[PDB]
């Protein structure tokens, strides 16, 4: 099927870029779109055969080529803030004979006017309350990720070292903090709901993970703070019970019992040696 | 094709339509785009009638000049965007803009409440949470400029066959409590604001008690030491009655 | 990358500790402290260290078709044999000590006299 590369990308005003489209089922002709709120899919360029290209609907600033019969990249000459969009690639068999189009997965781009606005996120996990555990006998956990620009995150839950997919609902759209300014940061939340007798174990391990996509190792940085790159931020918790008797206090009870019985057994062997020696010396004094 | 999100309750017939005046097209199809993903083909018809693929059904009226689509027995997994497209015999297909759909689930036992979740000791926020609703409740954005409200979402837990509605509020400032957080929204009577007089059940904590193998071995070593003490103490009683009787 | 290609794979349901070798090959050989300890073909890709209550240490390596990799030092201290010094521990200790020394001394008093 159609695949394309990359997924997320950040660049500054006046910087070139090339992104790949690929195909593997011997079709011949391909396209490029861009999708915006209120407009939908608008065509940019296309190429009816290996060697020939055509123009579309919004072609300003896009130079294409067709070298092989499976490849069709797309170049930006210089970047402008109006290039901020989502780009797709399609494919058809042969000139309307079989009109099944296959689209790609997407590629999100943002153009900023300065690289001093990129920020990584901050993650926190908030443990469930006791009134829910006693009222409905289920428990909910909340993950919050705040204050990141641009909006290029992916969030997941991990219980005992493995991903879960059941019992999770994440927001569709990242909110804005103040929606009045131009460069404004975002936030995003997520939930996991679990039965009560699964959170009460002090043996289960819960965590929330965020994958951020940012800068790279080719970029100038003359700012004081660290360089915001592609990294993973996370936050954890052990399950915990408040009242009652767990398997954390049983172990303490058993440890103190073994050391007390070791001491007491040593004292009893001392007394056995004493009265044995007394009976032997009396046995000598009988003779 | 008209935009604007429409609501259909769970398990009914849905009616979508596009009007294409004026041309004479041959080929017709429908696409579906979820959140943050790419379009996907459902159905591909170019003769007047019905080309069924399950619970999906298209129709074309030629001289009346519209297409249509019926979905039946709908679940909350159909919330997406539908895009009708067409072409002539040559290239360059023509799309609409798209129609947003939301399906709301069945809410068999409601019990609305607002809970205060425990803090984090590494950030200085506090979260209130407004759980299961009845799906007729609307949740409204915040009055202030320092209080953040999210929309309502639907989660699904398959280990109990249970589904539910939620909404989350959070803020930095002081004088923030869960009795004054969801003030701007309409709210039902007889929700449940709790009191901080805690109630932890004790027979419920015992239902989650695991066991290692190290703990089994330590309990058998205690049961060894106790038999050794009883035997050596018996020997001490015998010898001291021997010296005490003479 | 810098020839660091050994990793730790933790937090499983049982207390096991597993190591992974990030080299593209079949038939990976392992090492601890410079000497060979194991052997592992395909359909198993992780060396098992055992439960973490035995708290392993040491320095591990793995090789494939190219040269060896740089070591990794592991150090678990998950204490599991610790007693906390509270009111209840010290009162239990002193109560057992008092009653034992009293009974023993009464017995020696009647053996002597």
């Amino acid at each position: 099927g159609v695949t394309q590369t990359p997924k997320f990308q950040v660049l500054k005003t006046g910087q070139s870029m090339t992104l790949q489209c690929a195909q593997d089922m011997n079709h011949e002709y391909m396209s490029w779109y861009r999708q915006d709120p209120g407009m939908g899919l608008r065509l940019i360029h296309y190429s009816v055969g290996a060697g020939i290209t055509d123009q579309g609907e919004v072609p300003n600033g896009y130079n294409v080529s067709r070298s092989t019969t499976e490849d069709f990249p797309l170049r930006l000459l210089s970047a402008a803030p109006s290039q901020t969009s989502v780009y797709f690639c399609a494919s058809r068999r042969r000139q309307g004979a079989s009109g099944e189009q296959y689209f790609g997965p997407g590629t999100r781009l943002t153009v900023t006017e300065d690289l001093k606005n990129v920020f990584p996120p901050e993650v926190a996990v908030f443990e469930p309350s006791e009134a829910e555990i006693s009222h409905t006998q289920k428990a909910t956990l909340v993950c919050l990720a705040t204050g990141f620009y641009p909006d290029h995150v992916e969030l997941s839950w991990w219980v005992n070292g493995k991903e879960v997919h059941s019992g999770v609902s994440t927001d569709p759209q990242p909110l804005k903090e103040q929606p009045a300014l131009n460069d404004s940061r975002y936030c995003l939340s997520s939930r996991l709901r679990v039965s009560a007798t699964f959170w009460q174990n002090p043996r289960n391990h819960f965590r929330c993970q965020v994958q951020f996509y940012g800068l790279s190792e080719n970029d100038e940085w003359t700012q004081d703070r660290a360089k915001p790159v592609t990294q993973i931020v996370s936050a954890e918790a052990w399950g915990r019970a408040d009242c009652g008797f767990t398997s954390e206090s049983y172990q303490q009870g058993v440890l103190s019992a073994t050391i007390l019985y070791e001491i007491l057994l040593g004292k009893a062997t001392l007394y056995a040696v004493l009265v044995s020696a007394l009976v032997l010396m009396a046995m000598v004094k009988r003779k | 094709q008209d935009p604007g999100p429409l609501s259909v309750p769970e398990g009914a017939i849905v009616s979508l339509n596009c009007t294409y005046s004026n041309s004479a097209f041959q080929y017709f199809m429908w696409y579906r785009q979820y959140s943050r993903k790419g379009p996907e083909l459902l159905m591909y018809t170019y003769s007047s009638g019905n080309k069924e693929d399950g619970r999906f059904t298209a129709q074309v009226d030629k001289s009346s000049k519209y297409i249509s689509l019926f979905i039946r027995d709908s679940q909350p997994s159909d919330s997406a965007t539908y895009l009708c497209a067409m072409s002539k015999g040559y290239s360059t297909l023509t799309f609409g803009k798209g129609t947003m759909l939301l399906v709301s689930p069945d809410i068999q036992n409601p019990d609305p409440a607002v809970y205060q979740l425990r803090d984090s000791k590494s950030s200085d926020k506090s979260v209130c949470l407004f759980t299961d609703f009845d799906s007729q409740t609307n949740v409204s954005q915040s009055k202030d400029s320092d209080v953040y409200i999210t929309d309502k979402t639907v989660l699904d837990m398959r280990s109990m066959d249970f589904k539910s509605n939620s909404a989350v509020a959070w803020s930095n400032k002081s004088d923030f409590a869960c009795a004054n957080a969801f003030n701007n929204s309409i709210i039902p009577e007889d929700t449940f604001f709790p009191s901080p007089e805690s109630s932890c059940d004790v027979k419920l904590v015992e239902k989650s008690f695991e066991t290692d193998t190290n703990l089994n071995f330590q309990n058998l070593s205690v049961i060894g030491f106790r038999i050794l003490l009883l035997k050596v103490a018996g020997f001490n009683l015998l010898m001291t009655l021997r010296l005490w009787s003479s | 990358k810098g020839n660091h290609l050994v990793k730790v794979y933790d937090y499983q349901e049982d207390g096991s500790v597993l190591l992974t070798c990030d080299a593209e090959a079949k038939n990976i050989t392992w090492f601890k402290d410079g000497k060979m300890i194991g052997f592992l073909t395909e359909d198993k890709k992780k060396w098992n260290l055992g439960s973490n209550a035995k708290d392993p240490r040491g320095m591990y390596q793995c090789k494939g078709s190219q040269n060896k990799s740089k070591p990794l030092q592991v150090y678990y201290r998950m204490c599991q044999n610790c007693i906390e010094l509270n009111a209840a521990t010290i009162s239990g200790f002193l109560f057992a000590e008092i009653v034992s020394i009293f009974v023993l001394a009464v017995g020696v008093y009647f053996i002597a006299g």
């Binding site: 008797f245 049983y250 009870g253 058993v254 019992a257 | 015992e206 008690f209 005490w244 | 009653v99 009974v103």
Partner: peptide, 29 residues
């Protein structure tokens, strides 16, 4: 109960009883 402190404390009483009663027994006979 699962808590073993009542099991260890329940034999601490029977030990002291078994000392007292034999002491009185050898005081009589």
């Amino acid at each position: 109960l699962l808590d073993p402190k009542l099991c260890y404390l329940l034999d601490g009483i029977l030990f002291i009883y078994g000392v007292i009663l034999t002491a009185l027994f050898l005081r009589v006979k």
